[model samples]
Target chain A: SGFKKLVSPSSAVEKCIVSVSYRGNNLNGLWLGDSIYCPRHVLGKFSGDQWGDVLNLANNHEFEVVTQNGVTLNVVSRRLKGAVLILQTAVANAETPKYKFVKANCGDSFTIACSYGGTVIGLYPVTMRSNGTIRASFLAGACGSVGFNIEKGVVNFFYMHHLELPNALHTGTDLMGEFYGGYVDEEVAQRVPPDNLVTNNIVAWLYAAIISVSQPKWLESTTVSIEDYNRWASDNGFTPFSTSTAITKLSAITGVDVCKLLRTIMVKSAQWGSDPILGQYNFEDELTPESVFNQV
Target chain B: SSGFKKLVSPSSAVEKCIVSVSYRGNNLNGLWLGDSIYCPRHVLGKFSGDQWGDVLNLANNHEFEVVTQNGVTLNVVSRRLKGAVLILQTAVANAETPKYKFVKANCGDSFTIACSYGGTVIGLYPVTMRSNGTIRASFLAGACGSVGFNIEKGVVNFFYMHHLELPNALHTGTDLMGEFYGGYVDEEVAQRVPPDNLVTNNIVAWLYAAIISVKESSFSQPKWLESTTVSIEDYNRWASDNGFTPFSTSTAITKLSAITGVDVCKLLRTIMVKSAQWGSDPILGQYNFEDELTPESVFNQVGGVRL
Candidate 1:
């Protein structure tokens, strides 16, 4: 008996009615009996990728994780028994280059690869055993002109072996450092090149040119002659520009008369500088004890 | 014996002995003995008081024994002593003025007798004995005479002394030796007597007067005035008359003057003669060092050091 039910329902119904509905029970049955999945897209975006998540999860669940923004990270692992559990995570911007991952384990063989612009530049292989220590070398192609690698936990680059570049032009008269001319070995004047020519000739010619150019007026007023200069140059076996050539060039360049310029250059060459012919008087018969004895 | 002429033959007739009639003997022992024997009257006058015979016998025995008439017998005595003999004999006539008798011994003694008027006025006997035992004596008589004697055994003679008569009254000086003067010792006054009246003065005066009269003047100059001519005898008489008084001042002056000049000269001569043995000077040959060397220098050079 329903209370005569509803003969007249009051405006505020004092009599309670409980109704129960079950409409989404069929959708829960649809998730049943299949693998449970979560899509990244369905989950909101993260700071890293899927492997990053694994790493982060492993760090969080098992190993301690520390990340540096501008610094490298290191991890050391050893398997004692059973299954090893590791979780790691990292977050980087797209502008960062790819970092190489290296792992070493007891009784495990490993390969290190260097890449440039998505292409392998070099490769190195290493074998490892339970020897307690391992040493290896590798080349890491740089993202820019500079590059680095990771070994154990340290990052390295090829800068350990610096290579000096070959010189382009070697000038004996090159001025550098604290002096106008480079440091010349004192024995350079005595050494013979592959051509078996006297080295002093070159040094003398350079010294004479330098002196002639340095003191022109002094050279101009000198009393030596071109023939004498040429003879001296020939006697000393000075190659390249001899006394004749020197006289010609000196006259032409200085606009002094040929004879006068030749004489000036010859005198300048004779008096100053370190030519064997100019320095010959210092080593002359009078300068030698034996020659002086002969003369006496 | 008077006027008896006889002749006898050599064998039968006898030879004649000549007898001349001359009165030869005189009786000296008679009155004639007192007369001067050398008187001319007595020698020529006749003897009357005694006969001729007695006279002749007396003369023959004594006075004329060495003489005779008609060839006389001259029996003179001879044969005296050997080394030397000096005999002194005197003959006396009547009273006559006597003279000095001088006897010189050959040994050096001399005896002198001053005889006058038959008596000796003075007798001086000076004797000098020589190194050889001879004796010589020099004598003086009165103021006018002197005599020297040299006796060796008994001989005596006038060796040499001086004698003189009275000098002229004008000449007051006399020279005895060559440069010596006698008579008055003082030379200034015209006096007969000298300042010294001793016998030596008379004798020296006589000696000087006789020497000056006889000696040649060439020995030296006369040291007296020519106007003085007093005889040494007269000077002696005068000195005797004047009591032989000496002029004390004048005698000293004359002696001093004479000593400085002539006496000194003589003394110098004697010294030179004594020292002449040393040497003669080449320059002044006659002058001697004795004359040149003063007595002071001589005393210094010789006597001073030697003593």
Candidate 2:
């Protein structure tokens, strides 16, 4: 039975069993290095539908989780340089295996989806060959995940490519393991669709609008007007927005007024020039040796 | 009234005194007060040479007297009048070697003389002008020196002496021309030596005083000491032009000893010792004039460091 293989030790002893909970939902599985090697249903109410699992844990807020066994296990959420993890202390049912196992045949095929920073961003599918070993690959290069594959009668080998999806799991005809994935590229993670890209664009455009209207050398006078900002944006190859449209979009993120934002940026530019750390911002006209030294 | 003539008018309102003023038996009106008589150079010329010879007699005797309103015998009155004057009451060339100099004065014309000793005026004495006006001056009490003034007529005069010592009770003043030592070169000496140093002259006195003033000045000496763009020579020139010094080691020590009356080199050595004591501490040890030993440099160490 799949449960028997799941409970069986890849090493000498079945060290511990772990019960993991994410946002009040609990799932019990074997403990592996502070991680719960749980079945797929631990992520969501899995009735063998891919779409149902896609929405699973999407509302779990980052990767925070709680893990325990017979005794309480301390758990912590960490965003590492290469991966995100919810680790556990494996102190429960240490002397005995907690679940019964019966040898059974694995299913044919299944899909595993990964999300990071509360967004579903990638998918990987696994299929069993005639020899009963599973082959799998994540389709998107966007973010990566950590997973392990077991060859028929072979030991499981783990890999962490890019992102880490919390509570991801998989099963094969001969072996079972858990996996996690998330976004790996820093800029893409925050600036791509399903992230904060729209607001980032708005910030950059607002700065450009302020600079265009405040260039004293190019304009007769400086102003912080919506009309001048729209004209400047259009001149700089950005689509112009009405005052109401700017107020509505920016109001969703900040309580600041549009014209006030332009004035603030302009004032900050002057303040930067006055910083003592920067030192001696103003300069005299170019000097020549003759003018300086009174040379013949 | 006896062989004395009142002039038709007074020299000026400041010199207007109804007094007996005379030169060589010819009574004339001139400036005279109770203590002294002002015989102007122009008034000395009204009489003939024979008459001027009699006027020289009264100066030579040191017994000439004039009666003023309140009536007092006039003391010494003479000239060659601005800058520095040396007074000699008598000439004793046989008794001691006098400072030899060629002086031009009419016979028996009493000259008011001043004596300068290391840029200081010892005193002025009345000297009866003779054919060889060998004038001598006395400096320290009971200490003696000589200045020989060879009196001649119708020629320029020069004096040469180390110093002079003379005892004459009739000697009236010292530094009469206001040429006293403050380490400043008077306009005459400054004009004579275009870009002005010597140990005993007014210039050296001024240079010594200049260095002392810099030492006591509140300005930073270390900044000037460490500056590469400007130099000590540059400072010396600016100071010399504006009444300052470039006293070298030998000259500064010697002249500064002569003028300052303080052991300047000893002061420098002690400062160097103190700098060595605190040298490792950097801040307190920082001082100027590590290399130079000139009095200008040595005295520059006065306020160079903090305690």
Candidate 3:
């Protein structure tokens, strides 16, 4: 009066589920026979196809009205890097023990995608794996819901930045968990798709984007005002103290508010308060080098 | 009678005139007004009378002023200028008093001297052979002068065309030109009568008066004048042809100063000062000096563009 497993083709993907089947009696003839899959995408249910009770027996498969929900499993994936996620999990309401897995292949890691038009706006930490794969474990912490996988013999497995859709990090399953609760990978019936797990690269990708504001150059023009301020400001016995009230007198004079994230730019801007850098910034502001060059 | 000279009392004078009455022979007869002389009121050369109307009395373009003091009259004859002038006499006659007639020659006006010898049998007046001079601006031109000794001012000091109008008396200097009295003396200096009294030497006196009127004058002169002084021409005439200094001729500066009665150094400084102050001295303003009369600048000079 419970569920049993069997492998066969259904209205799913190119590959079919297979293995052995169940031959039984008190099992109420076992609504289902035996089955095998990638590991976990809920293959079936109880009662829908009329089966038996479960809790009273042991494990839903022991006694529920059974019907195979036809799930595709994603488990025991090997990494080109030779490391495995080793996630552990059980079939929902089923009577299956936990499972383990191996790493799949990780490729050349040539390309990546990220915010700001799929390009890397910044650089982040990277690591190499024994399987000729690259790992960025640092991003793993920020990727709460993120998931990652490995590939084998692929043209190029990119180590890149693309925290966008499809690749946004989601939850994870430990190695022994047998791909439980895996959606990003559980859908496919055959081999891993080209970019399926690649999205996991986003954990690190977004972290890079988030961490990098770009080199100091892209922030603001360096040093403004004539370097003269230093001579005069110092000569006049006026020294600047970094600490000031909410609105500093210097800020009032220069119109620079330092509390902002962009405040770092104020250093260079105020350094040479009068620097026109005129030529560099504008295409049309007519400039006089004599003023900036020969000035005392 | 043609060579005869006569004298009369101070106010009464002896003049030559002819009264014509013809017997068919056509001869002009002479009339003698003698002891009844009454003394000619000290008429100015040919023109006489103590009034502005006396000018109209001149049958010719010539006119003169009758300046009276101490019951005696003297005059400043016409300088023959067409510019305007003002004349106002506020004094009466007194014994030792001497009066003056002011002639404020204006710019663009002819400045000339009238002669009084042939008729004077006793006076000295200069006649300008060249009537081509003018008072530069003749600023006092349109108004401010008239004829008569009672006038408050007179051209007592004149340098070229710049003249000074003052109430000072034109000296009847007996020692100057031997008592022919034809120039003025510095009032304060007159009584003190310094040695080389050449200070009163008629025209020489004029040079001194001019130099004195200047508020400033040093190696500085008017732009035009100084330019001329430093000009190569001055150097050529006064300095050596090689364009060096110490001068080629002593007469250029040494004697010239004596003749002009002005020191080259003081002259320039004075002229310079005068020029700068000319605004207030219309008399000085109208007189523009063409040559830089400085000796060092002209004679003892060094290097510069020849011109």
Which CAPRI category fits model 1?
A: incorrect
Chain B alone, TM-score of each model? 0.18, 0.23, 0.19
lDDT of 1: 0.22
TM-score of chain B of 3: 0.19
In candidate 2, stretches whose alpha carbon ends up further than 4 angstroms from where it belongs are: A1-296, B1-43, B46-65, B68-70, B73-201, B217-219, B222-307
Per-candidate TM-score against the hidden true structure: 0.13, 0.16, 0.14
- Once fitted onto the true fold, the runs of candidate 3 whose alpha carbons sit more than 4 angstroms away are A1-296, B1-132, B141-252, B255-307
- lDDT for A74 (candidate 2): 49
- What 10-residue stretch in candidate 3 chain A is worst by lDDT? A1-10
lDDT of 3 by residue, B83-129 (tens): 11112122232222222222332111112221111121111111110
Cα lDDT tens digits, model 3, A230-268, are: 333333322221222422332343333323212322332
By the TM-score metric, which is better: model 1 or model 3?
A: 3
Worst 10 residues of 2 chain B by lDDT: B1-10
Q: How many clashing pairs does model 3 include?
A: 94
